[PDB]
């Protein structure tokens, strides 16, 4: 979901 977990 990516480094900052912004992919829901």
């Amino acid at each position: 979901a990516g480094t900052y977990g912004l992919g829901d």
Partner: antibody
Amino acid sequence: VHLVESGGALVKPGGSLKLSCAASGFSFSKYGMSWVRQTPDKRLEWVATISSSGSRTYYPDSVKGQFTISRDNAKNTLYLQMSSLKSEDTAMYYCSISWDGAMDYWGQGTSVTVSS
Amino acid sequence: DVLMTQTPLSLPVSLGDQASISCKSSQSIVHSNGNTYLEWYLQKPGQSPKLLVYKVSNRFSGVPDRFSGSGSGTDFTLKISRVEAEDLGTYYCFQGSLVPWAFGGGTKLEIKR
């Protein structure tokens, strides 16, 4: 890999403005996105971040409740609504996507001038 | 709010030279999940910022290996082994570990004479 901001303009103190960011060259609905602005002194300030679906929004104290980030994944477009603008909001406004870092790729920016 | 301070303000180099830029935080950027979200951005004159390094030492896609990031806790460094014309511009560090997200004030890589 293409990000194009728009909506920048001359606006009076107290006024409002809606910025847009048209994206292409990647899966739009996969990435969280952000707005960052550059003031005339060339300082960078993080303005807002939104999750891939639009479910989650994040703001610094300075613009909380005054700015609103949103997105339309069907139209591959990111938005920034700004209200009660003051001279200090005069800046270049950049949209970006996040993956490996906070802002992996940046657009060319759109210019906002707040003045009467 | 954690503060990011960069030194020096301006770094005069000759093309060919090694360069070192420092970035310090007012508090530890080490996140509770074990990561340190320290990032470096380059803004070339008249252009938008670009990502160079993320998570302290990971080079972003396309970034040549003459760039290297290091450091820990509060003290961080970006090094350039041999400076090329394309490297001239303003380097900003960035922290993503703590709320709110913050940029350093920038370091200008410029020409020595």
